[PDB]
Amino acid sequence: DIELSQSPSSLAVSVGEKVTLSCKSSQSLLYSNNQKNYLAWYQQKPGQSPKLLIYWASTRESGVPDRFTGSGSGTDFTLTISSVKAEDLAVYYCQQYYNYPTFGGGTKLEIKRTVAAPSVFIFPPSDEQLKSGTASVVCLLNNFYPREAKVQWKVDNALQSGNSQESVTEQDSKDSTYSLSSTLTLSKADYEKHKVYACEVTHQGLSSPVTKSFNRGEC
Amino acid sequence: EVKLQESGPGILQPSQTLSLTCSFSGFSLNTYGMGVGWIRQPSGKGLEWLANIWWTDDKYYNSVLKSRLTISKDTFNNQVFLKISSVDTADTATYYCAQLAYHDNPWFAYWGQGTLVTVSSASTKGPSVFPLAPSSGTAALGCLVKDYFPEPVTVSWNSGALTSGVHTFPAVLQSSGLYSLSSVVTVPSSSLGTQTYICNVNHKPSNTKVDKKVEPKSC
Amino acid sequence: APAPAAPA
Ligand SMILES: [Cl-]
């Protein structure tokens, strides 16, 4: 079929700025006998289905703001976003329909914003869960930037290794921060036999690392 | 207004035949120039077109997958079907159906929400749901959704009434081969006494629907 | 020339 190649693979842009997303075609999408370019652009926001922006390379779908502009001809196409909003965070895909549909690999548009220090919370295992003979300790790093954060687990002041999993959110479509969960997995036995549970967060918006901790049983 | 809902198995075994249903209102394959497309997306990968069917009952297939694909419609022309034979791990993806562009135009005007399809021999398991109780300016509370297969679980707070500050983390596969995630929300400390916080956790493949009241813990 | 996934 026809191959579409999108560049750059990922863009990091401040709110208010102007970005140009490229889509290169392995065959010309310009039909001489109607002078139309057979290219569409889509926007996929995190969590959502792709949404149509542009068709025939340069025509806006109704409801699409004027700051999204489709351009180019033949093998070279661009989607210009003239003053990036935070809501524009998304993967942008080009698609040809000159032959059987193919998509480019997409351009991931990320928002470059100011440092925000995490708010750190720690959650003991629920009594409900302790019945089930397994214990999960959860540490929350909330509404922080940038994405890079170090999370360390201490049980009775001893550094833990190989028994925690982290999960990070996509960039927020509103305030452009991230959140991170670190989950420490212990046996009910191991949890019941130790006392002090501490989460230590290193992130660049903090003067010094923040530790959140609890003792099993106490209030 | 146009509406599309994908229906799929959630999980089927390697070598089995994937059977997907697209149910749509607000348009018909009775009308001239109308059609439905299928597009799939592996986790964190891009878009692959599968097949289109039109009002003429003309069928167009992805050339690479052609020999494994079948697409059809019913006599009422309100539902479109896609088969994929001899599924393998690489067929694990989110599957979308889409209204093809009005008057015989092969771009994708409106997309359905998409159904997740996992190719695995492992058995379906429903989640345990556990409260993450708020500690006692800003509080955090949540629900640990643990030991379920396959993806996905859907999490809402107060039957969709509560959305601001909600963070539902991507699932992580545990050493057991079962997924686990937390859904967390940040609220005013001053709301902990009065506002009710219920997490609604839906796991389609296991027909599991749990509601958990998260309240400040008792010492 | 165009050979789209669409009737002539
Ligand atoms: Cl999930």
CATH number at residue B14: 2.60.40.10
Neighbours of B41 (CB within 10 A): 22
Q: Residue B87 corresponds to which tokens in the numbers above?
A: 């599924």
Q: Residue B187 corresponds to which tokens in the numbers above?
A: 């609220």
Edge-to-edge order in the sheet of strand A134-144: A119-123, A134-144, A178-187, A164-168
Secondary structure (3-state) at B147: strand
What are the C-alpha distances in Å from A195 to residues A94, A189, A215, A216?
A: 55, 12, 5, 5
Asked whether the beta carbons of residue C2 and residue A100 sit closer than 8 angstroms, the reply is: no
Backbone angles phi, psi at B190, to 5 degrees: -70, -10
Q: How far is C2 from chain B (nearest CA, A)?
A: 11
Question: Do B9 and B39 belong together in one domain?
Answer: yes
Q: How far is A78 from chain C (nearest CA, A)?
A: 21
B131 neighbors B212 (Cβ within 8 angstroms): yes
End-to-end Cα, chain C, rounded Å: 12
Is B219 part of a structural domain of the chain? no
- A4-111: CATH topology is Immunoglobulin-like (2.60.40)
Is B108 part of a structural domain of the chain? yes
Q: Please give the residue of chain A at the shortest CA–CA distance from B115.
A: A49
Asked whether the beta carbons of residue B37 and residue A93 sit closer than 8 angstroms, the reply is: no
Residue B90 DSSP label: G
- Chain A hits for B184, Cβ within 8 Å: 121, 140, 142, 179, 181
Handedness of CA B194, B130, A171, A54 (dihedral sign): negative
- CB burial of residue B76 (10 Å; 0-12, 13-18, 19+): exposed
What's the number of domains chain B is made of? 2
- CB burial of residue B157 (10 Å; 0-12, 13-18, 19+): buried
Is B218 part of a structural domain of the chain? no
Q: Please give the residue of chain B at the shortest CA–CA distance from C2.
A: B106
Q: How far is B33 from chain C (nearest CA, A)?
A: 9
- Is the CB of residue C8 less than 8 Å away from at least one CB of chain A? no
Residue found under tokens 């909003």:
A85
Give the list of residues 6+ apart from residue A128 with CB closer than 8 angstroms, or none.
B130, B131
Question: Do B132 and B115 belong together in one domain?
Answer: no
- Residue type at A212 in one-letter notation: K
- Is the CB of residue C6 less than 8 Å away from at least one CB of chain A? yes
Residues of chain A with CATH 2.60.40.10: 4-111, 119-215
* Cα–Cα dist B88/B153, whole Å: 23
Asked whether the beta carbons of residue B180 and residue A183 sit closer than 8 angstroms, the reply is: yes
Residue B114 DSSP label: -
- The runs of H, that is alpha helices, within B135-196 are none
* Cα–Cα dist B44/A104, whole Å: 14
Q: Residue B219 corresponds to which tokens in the numbers above?
A: 């010492």
Q: Cα of A128 to ligand 1 centre, how many Å?
A: 22
Secondary structure (3-state) at B106: strand
* Cα–Cα dist B131/A124, whole Å: 10
Question: Do B27 and B101 belong together in one domain?
Answer: yes
Residue B78 DSSP label: S
* Cα–Cα dist B120/A99, whole Å: 34
Final residue of a structural domain among B97, B119, B141 = B119
Question: Do B114 and B12 belong together in one domain?
Answer: yes
Asked whether the beta carbons of residue A95 and residue B47 sit closer than 8 angstroms, the reply is: yes
Neighbours of A185 (CB within 10 A): 18
* Cα–Cα dist B11/B119, whole Å: 6
Q: Which of A41, A39, A43 is nearest to A27 (CA)?
A: A39
- Is the CB of residue C4 less than 8 Å away from at least one CB of chain A? yes
The separation between CA B92 and the C-alpha centre of its own chain, rounded to angstroms, equals 13
Q: Cα of B106 to ligand 1 centre, how many Å?
A: 32
A198, β-bridge pairs: A154, A213
Range of the domain at B183: 128-213
Question: Do B111 and B82 belong together in one domain?
Answer: yes
Could you tell me where the beta strands, DSSP code E, fall in B138-197? 138-148, 154-157, 166-168, 172-173, 179-188
Question: Do B7 and B113 belong together in one domain?
Answer: yes
B53 neighbors B36 (Cβ within 8 angstroms): yes
Asked whether the beta carbons of residue A33 and residue C3 sit closer than 8 angstroms, the reply is: no
Question: Do B59 and B28 belong together in one domain?
Answer: yes
Q: Cα of B209 to ligand 1 centre, how many Å?
A: 14
A103 neighbors A94 (Cβ within 8 angstroms): yes
Question: Do B35 and B113 belong together in one domain?
Answer: yes
The separation between CA A101 and the C-alpha centre of its own chain, rounded to angstroms, equals 27
- CB burial of residue A126 (10 Å; 0-12, 13-18, 19+): buried
Question: Do B113 and B145 belong together in one domain?
Answer: no
Q: How far is B3 from chain C (nearest CA, A)?
A: 22
What H or E segment, with its residue span, contains residue B40?
strand B35-41
Q: Please give the residue of chain A at the shortest CA–CA distance from C6.
A: A100
Q: Classify strands A19-25 and A4-7 as parallel, antiparallel or unpaired.
A: antiparallel
A93 neighbors A41 (Cβ within 8 angstroms): yes
Q: Which of B19, B24, B20 is nearest to B77 (CA)?
A: B24
A57 neighbors A73 (Cβ within 8 angstroms): yes
Give me the resolution in angstroms, 1 decimal. 2.5
Final residue of a structural domain among B65, B100, B119 = B119
Q: Which of A152, A153, A22, A36 is nearest to A93 (CA)?
A: A22
Secondary structure (3-state) at B115: strand
Neighbours of A77 (CB within 10 A): 26
* Cα–Cα dist B156/B106, whole Å: 36
Asked whether the beta carbons of residue A119 and residue B131 sit closer than 8 angstroms, the reply is: no
Question: Do B113 and B149 belong together in one domain?
Answer: no
Secondary structure (3-state) at C7: coil
Question: Do B67 and B97 belong together in one domain?
Answer: yes
Is B56 part of a structural domain of the chain? yes
- Is the CB of residue B208 less than 8 Å away from at least one CB of chain A? no
Q: Cα of B65 to ligand 1 centre, how many Å?
A: 28
Q: Cα of B103 to ligand 1 centre, how many Å?
A: 38
CATH 3.40.50.300 is the classification of domain A119-215: no
Q: Residue A81 corresponds to which tokens in the numbers above?
A: 């976003």
A61 neighbors A41 (Cβ within 8 angstroms): no
Q: Cα of B203 to ligand 1 centre, how many Å?
A: 9
Neighbours of B173 (CB within 10 A): 12
Residue B87 DSSP label: -
SS (H, E, C) chain A: CCCEEEECCEEEECCCCCEEEEEEECCCCEECCCCEECEEEEEECCCCCCEEEEECCCEECCCCCCCEEEEEECCEEEEEECCCCHHHCEEEEEEECCCCCEECCCEEEEECCCCECCEEEEECCCHHHHHCCEEEEEEEEEEEECCCCEEEEEECCEECCCCEEEEECCCCCCCCCEEEEEEEEEEHHHHHHCCEEEEEEECCCCCCCEEEEEECCCC
